Amino acid sequence: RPRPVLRSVNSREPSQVIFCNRSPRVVLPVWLNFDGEPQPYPTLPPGTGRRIHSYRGHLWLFRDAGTHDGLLVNQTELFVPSLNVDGQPIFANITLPVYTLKERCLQVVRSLVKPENYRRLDIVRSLYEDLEDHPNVQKDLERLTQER
Amino acid sequence: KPNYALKFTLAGHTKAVSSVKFSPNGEWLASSSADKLIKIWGAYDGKFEKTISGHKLGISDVAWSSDSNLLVSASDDKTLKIWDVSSGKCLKTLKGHSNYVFCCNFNPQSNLIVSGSFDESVRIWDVKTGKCLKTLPAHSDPVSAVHFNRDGSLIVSSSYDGLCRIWDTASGQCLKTLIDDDNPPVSFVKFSPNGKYILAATLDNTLKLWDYSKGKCLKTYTGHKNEKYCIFANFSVTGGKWIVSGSEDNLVYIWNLQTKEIVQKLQGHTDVVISTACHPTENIIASAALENDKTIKLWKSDC
Amino acid sequence: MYVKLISSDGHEFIVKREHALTSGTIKAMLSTNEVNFREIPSHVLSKVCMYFTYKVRYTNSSTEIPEFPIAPEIALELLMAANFLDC
Amino acid sequence: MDVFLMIRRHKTTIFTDAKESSTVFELKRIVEGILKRPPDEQRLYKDDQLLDDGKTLGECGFTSQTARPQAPATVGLAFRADDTFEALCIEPFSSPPELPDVM
Ligand SMILES: Cc1ncsc1-c1ccc(CNC(=O)[C@@H]2C[C@@H](O)CN2C(=O)[C@@H](NC(=O)CCCCCCCCCC(=O)NCCN2CCN(Cc3cccc(-c4ccc(N5CCN(C)CC5)c(NC(=O)C5=C(C(F)(F)F)CC(=O)N=C5)c4)c3)CC2)C(C)(C)C)cc1
Ligand code: NA
């Protein structure tokens, strides 16, 4: 069975959005083009927000810009602008997920250890593999596809 | 049906070739390229004549004055340049656009230049002084093509906003817009030689021939591939009456204007054929291709 | 209701049952309301309990969520514990 | 304004939450539910300072900013039976090993 390509619908209907970075990370906005390919956009420092122009039915994801850890937007993975009403921008509130303790530990250990050095750590092999399985937008694309 | 065959390949440029234009006197072919250069070639034998340099970034388009003495170039460096072809001198640098200049054309009198830019404006320039006379910003996305009509009283522009706009040259006011049921980006537009129609390309693999007096689409040409690049199309009227266009499958497509049937596909280029030109008096087509190719080809036909 | 989680060095950590059941391992070990860990030491288990509180407080809360801080000196053992506890 | 706490005595640590407006006495009632000693047999401390039963947690220094779910503030606990008062005594946690070379 053909699996749906998560992609922006090319509606050519403008939508103004506030990208609100309510996280402590440097945020990389990621726009899925009409072919479903991720495109990185300019980054947002923690504690900042920007008014930006997008379009109805376009698809956005948000990651840590340095580590590509996945982030949430309006409490979910994907942000899709709709039509503005009454001249009001659409807020895209970008926040930290509540990571599992294990994933948060992996994040910190990865931030401390060069990948080449992971297997010097005195831990079991499955934790090596966990450390080596870096965050990846494509993982979320695959999961959100298998959910639809 | 015509029988265009390859005669010459001109391999002078070191990057994508953006535009080829025959001089109105039929003697020369001008080519512009992402390598920041204009080159002049013999129209009939493809013999290199000269290199014209001055732009600081790649060149998107060139156009000849009616007397074949002047060229105008449109550049990524946000300027146009007016050149004396015999000397290779930059006569004027037209400044005013605030982003890449993609397209340019003289009017038939050749006292005006029209330009179109990523900055979403169409500009009208005085050839004598180089001053910008009017800025027309109604388009809401990059302008892909600009062309004057037979007496210079109209300008037609095409834009990624999906519109063709017909402008009154004297006042600057937009006299008409042209659009079908859908709004794909319009990648190319030009008035027919005869003046009655407008040929417009859209990034849905489609060329359309419009009666712009009646706002009616008369013909539609497909079979080629055109979804990404702004490909220049042409009327061929020296023999039979054909529509000519490049294609993203590296071919030159030739259609019968009335039947809309593909009558030829010219193979040889190894990248997107972004530009085609038709010789003013003889059955000669020039074509030019992007970065994997970098060459110009000249093709000739008995009809 | 509360449960008592006992570290390898004998520290007792009394936490709400709902917080402890964040870990399917702890749930399996509860099946007394006390769990004795044979290897996880107190400095790690106290951090795990703080994670439980943070997780329950901020999960599906629609608010700005702060980072869960982990010092480098504790990170590797905390990783080992989080893996074992599956939390 | 919520505050998140560790109430600590000997080798026992209770994780609980309260409010800046909660009184020390309320905290003792929470403790009583768990350890089964009444508030009049409890003394609560912030560092070496005995806390007055009627002061609110905010008046003692426990704010939402310094008493977070992920970094709770510590309240010390000591018991009392009639005329015998147990001194405040909190056993420290273990210590992490030397940070590995690759970190
Ligand atoms: C703050 C900030 N902080 C955190 S984040 C954030 C933020 C910042 C900014 C924004 C802006 N907002 C968005 O970006 C939104 C966000 C999201 O919602 C999507 N989106 C959009 O705006 C999108 N737009 C829309 O959704 C509605 C309108 C989009 C139009 C539909 C496009 C149809 C698909 C076609 C396609 O796939 N194209 C891809 C490849 N092209 C290649 C050319 N690119 C550049 C370009 C764009 C436009 C025109 C021309 C053009 C046109 C004509 C010519 N020439 C004409 C004359 N010929 C003779 C020659 C060619 C040339 N020129 C050339 O091509 C050229 C050369 C050559 F010809 F050789 F190639 C050589 C050379 O030296 N120089 C130039 C160029 C060229 C564009 C992409 C999009 C713009 C990202 C697409 C948002 C946030
Ligand atoms: Na990280």
Side-chain angles (χ1 to χ4, degrees), chain A residues 2-55 57-82 84-119 121-124 126-145 147, chain B residues 1-55 57-127 129-130 132-149 151-180 182-195 197-224 226-240 242-266 268-303, chain C residues 2-31 33-56 58-59 61 63-87, chain D residues 2-47 49-54 56-64 66-103:
Chain A
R3 306 159 95 253
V5 177
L6 306 188
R7 58 174 298 272
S8 291
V9 298
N10 184 8
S11 69
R12 309 205 64 181
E13 295 170 50
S15 173
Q16 305 252 108
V17 179
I18 307 279
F19 281 176
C20 195
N21 183 4
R22 305 187 194 271
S23 91
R25 314 294 193 81
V26 179
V27 169
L28 171 70
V30 175
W31 172 60
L32 301 187
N33 68 16
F34 307 126
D35 297 319
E37 188 190 28
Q39 308 295 326
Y41 268 65
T43 64
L44 312 163
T48 77
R50 281 180 203 160
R51 187 171 186 120
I52 67 100
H53 185 102
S54 184
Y55 295 90
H58 284 205
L59 265 70
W60 292 90
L61 300 139
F62 292 87
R63 318 294 290 202
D64 183 296
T67 68
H68 291 260
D69 298 328
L71 300 165
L72 294 181
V73 49
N74 298 343
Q75 306 294 300
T76 192
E77 293 95 356
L78 287 158
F79 175 71
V80 179
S82 46
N84 297 112
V85 293
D86 193 25
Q88 298 190 34
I90 303 174
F91 270 82
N93 292 303
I94 309 147
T95 59
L96 282 184
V98 177
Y99 296 116
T100 66
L101 180 57
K102 175 171 176 191
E103 183 58 38
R104 181 68 185 128
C105 288
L106 293 170
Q107 290 174 5
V108 172
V109 171
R110 290 169 185 142
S111 82
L112 295 161
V113 184
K114 285 215 283 182
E116 311 82 49
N117 287 321
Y118 288 158
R119 308 218 169 199
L121 297 169
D122 184 35
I123 56 182
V124 298
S126 65
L127 280 180
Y128 296 153
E129 305 176 341
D130 290 340
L131 282 167
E132 283 156 354
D133 187 19
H134 284 192
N136 186 350
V137 156
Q138 300 286 343
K139 289 198 266 223
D140 266 24
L141 292 186
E142 171 68 17
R143 184 168 53 77
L144 305 172
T145 284
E147 294 181 346
Chain B
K1 296 172 64 205
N3 63 345
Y4 279 99
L6 184 63
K7 300 302 178 185
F8 299 102
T9 302
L10 324 185
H13 285 290
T14 57
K15 290 185 75 67
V17 185
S18 54
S19 196
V20 289
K21 300 285 179 66
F22 288 106
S23 69
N25 67 11
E27 291 292 293
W28 311 108
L29 182 77
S31 64
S32 61
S33 170
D35 68 11
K36 325 190 184 182
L37 304 180
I38 297 162
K39 294 186 163 182
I40 307 292
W41 318 79
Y44 301 106
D45 58 10
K47 174 188 178 62
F48 175 78
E49 188 66 25
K50 74 171 62 189
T51 289
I52 292 182
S53 65
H55 278 294
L57 295 169
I59 306 174
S60 184
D61 202 10
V62 283
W64 291 86
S65 65
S66 286
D67 68 357
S68 310
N69 279 313
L70 304 182
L71 270 196
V72 62
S73 49
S75 177
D76 296 5
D77 71 13
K78 311 198 241 151
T79 73
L80 300 103
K81 280 173 186 300
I82 307 185
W83 313 87
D84 176 272
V85 174
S86 301
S87 43
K89 274 193 175 181
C90 178
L91 301 193
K92 295 288 198 312
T93 296
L94 318 186
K95 313 175 89 79
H97 278 296
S98 54
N99 214 312
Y100 290 12
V101 193
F102 289 142
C103 46
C104 52
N105 257 313
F106 283 90
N107 69 338
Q109 197 178 356
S110 289
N111 66 309
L112 304 172
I113 287 171
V114 65
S115 68
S117 164
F118 188 95
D119 77 10
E120 309 179 358
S121 68
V122 177
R123 279 177 186 252
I124 303 171
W125 310 81
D126 187 70
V127 168
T129 62
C132 188
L133 299 177
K134 281 181 181 61
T135 298
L136 324 179
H139 281 299
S140 78
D141 264 320
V143 181
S144 53
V146 291
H147 191 223
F148 283 99
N149 73 336
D151 69 355
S153 65
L154 302 181
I155 295 165
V156 68
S157 60
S158 55
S159 164
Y160 269 42
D161 61 18
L163 295 195
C164 292
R165 279 182 185 266
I166 292 167
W167 314 83
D168 180 74
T169 297
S171 68
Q173 291 191 52
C174 170
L175 299 176
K176 200 174 296 181
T177 69
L178 316 168
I179 202 178
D180 201 294
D182 203 5
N183 57 352
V186 193
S187 48
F188 166 83
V189 77
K190 96 174 297 179
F191 287 106
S192 65
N194 64 70
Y197 318 132
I198 270 168
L199 179 65
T202 42
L203 291 188
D204 55 8
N205 313 293
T206 306
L207 277 153
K208 291 188 186 176
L209 183 77
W210 289 84
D211 184 338
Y212 63 93
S213 308
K214 305 209 190 322
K216 180 162 55 172
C217 171
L218 305 178
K219 299 283 180 183
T220 296
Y221 315 91
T222 58
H224 61 311
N226 189 16
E227 283 162 4
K228 308 289 188 161
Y229 293 100
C230 289
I231 301 185
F232 209 92
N234 276 298
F235 299 80
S236 187
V237 302
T238 47
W242 324 111
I243 299 299
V244 177
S245 176
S247 185
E248 283 155 13
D249 55 12
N250 313 346
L251 302 174
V252 178
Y253 282 65
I254 311 177
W255 295 264
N256 181 305
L257 185 135
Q258 290 302 334
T259 76
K260 310 160 301 188
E261 275 327 288
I262 299 175
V263 294
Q264 251 190 305
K265 299 185 224 167
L266 317 179
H269 283 295
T270 56
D271 207 346
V272 172
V273 178
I274 192 94
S275 184
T276 60
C278 292
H279 191 274
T281 58
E282 306 286 340
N283 309 314
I284 304 175
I285 292 168
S287 59
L290 295 186
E291 307 79 17
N292 186 62
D293 182 309
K294 309 186 183 88
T295 72
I296 305 138
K297 282 162 193 295
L298 294 169
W299 323 71
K300 296 186 191 184
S301 164
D302 301 318
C303 68
Chain C
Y2 290 82
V3 303
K4 183 187 296 173
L5 313 171
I6 308 191
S7 71
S8 65
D9 53 324
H11 271 274
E12 303 178 339
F13 297 95
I14 296 178
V15 297
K16 290 167 196 181
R17 183 172 275 259
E18 168 187 10
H19 297 204
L21 295 180
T22 289
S23 154
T25 302
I26 293 181
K27 183 186 250 274
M29 300 169 89
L30 281 164
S31 309
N33 71 334
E34 73 173 40
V35 172
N36 280 271
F37 297 107
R38 311 174 69 230
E39 287 184 281
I40 300 163
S42 57
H43 73 278
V44 175
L45 183 53
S46 60
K47 192 72 178 192
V48 168
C49 295
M50 301 176 188
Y51 174 79
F52 291 159
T53 311
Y54 164 94
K55 191 253 181 45
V56 172
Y58 289 118
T59 286
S61 63
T63 188
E64 184 159 352
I65 284 159
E67 195 87 62
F68 185 82
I70 300 174
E73 296 79 10
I74 204 170
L76 194 67
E77 288 165 301
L78 201 56
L79 174 57
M80 305 171 50
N83 184 63
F84 172 83
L85 299 172
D86 183 41
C87 67
Chain D
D2 299 323
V3 296
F4 296 83
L5 313 170
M6 289 187 296
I7 305 164
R8 302 197 56 210
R9 168 183 180 285
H10 291 193
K11 292 178 80 171
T12 300
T13 296
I14 293 166
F15 280 82
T16 191
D17 60 294
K19 319 272 191 173
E20 279 168 14
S21 62
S22 292
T23 58
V24 170
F25 180 82
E26 295 186 43
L27 205 43
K28 288 185 179 178
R29 283 286 190 197
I30 295 168
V31 172
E32 164 181 50
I34 299 163
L35 310 181
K36 295 324 185 318
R37 301 288 294 270
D40 70 341
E41 291 174 26
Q42 307 178 29
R43 279 163 294 136
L44 295 185
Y45 294 82
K46 191 180 178 300
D47 297 326
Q49 170 71 57
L50 183 58
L51 303 179
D52 285 342
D53 272 352
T56 75
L57 296 186
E59 293 167 348
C60 292
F62 301 106
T63 169
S64 294
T66 72
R68 300 163 289 190
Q70 70 271 13
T74 291
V75 180
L77 165 64
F79 286 138
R80 172 215 180 155
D82 298 312
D83 286 331
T84 299
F85 295 72
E86 143 188 290
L88 175 62
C89 183
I90 302 164
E91 175 81 350
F93 300 145
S94 48
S95 274
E98 181 203 342
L99 183 81
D101 299 326
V102 302
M103 269 161 124

